[PDB]
């Protein structure tokens, strides 16, 4: 249920970001576009350097990234800044892959990201009232 909703949002964001195209999960995506695009624009150069270091070879070479996304939270801190920074890098990575192969898909990547968030941060996510909290946290 919470996995399903996260995967929807994350996948859709990543999917737009790569293809350039297109209740509460609906606002979570608006928020994601607004904020995520910000961090990608703001840190395009750092993401690029990191992306080159990922040696990510194909739509399924997501294990290096998953290792990375895990060590982020490896200090005991979770916040939406980190979470949203992870998804933005996911989008930034999703866009590169199409440069490399217009065919390749974002599913493995969306699932990679969701796995780490939902399955290792479940309790934290829950404590925050879920994507409702994320939406509230970034309200304008």
């Amino acid at each position: 249920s919470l996995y399903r909703q996260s995967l929807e949002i994350i996948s859709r964001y990543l999917r737009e970001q790569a293809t350039g195209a297109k209740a509460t999960s609906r606002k979570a995506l608006e928020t994601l576009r607004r904020v995520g695009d910000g961090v990608q624009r703001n840190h395009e150069t750092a993401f690029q350097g990191m992306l080159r270091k990922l040696d990510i070879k194909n739509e399924d070479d997501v294990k290096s990234l998953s290792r990375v996304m895990i060590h982020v939270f490896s200090d005991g801190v979770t916040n939406w800044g980190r979470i949203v920074t992870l998804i933005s890098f996911g989008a930034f990575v999703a866009k590169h892959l199409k440069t490399i192969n217009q065919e390749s898909c974002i599913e493995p990547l969306a699932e990679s990201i969701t796995d780490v968030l939902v399955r290792t941060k479940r309790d934290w996510l829950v404590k925050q009232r879920g994507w409702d909290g994320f939406v509230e946290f970034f309200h304008v």
């Binding site: 990191m50 996304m69 060590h71 980190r82």
Partner: peptide, 27 residues
């Protein structure tokens, strides 16, 4: 290996972004 270098980078941006919202919220 270098995984610690990349996670440290994303960690910072996330915190940077978090610090910015935490502020915009306190006011």
């Amino acid at each position: 290996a270098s995984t610690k270098k990349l996670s440290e980078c994303l960690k910072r941006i996330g915190d940077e972004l978090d610090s910015n919202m935490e502020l915009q919220r306190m006011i």
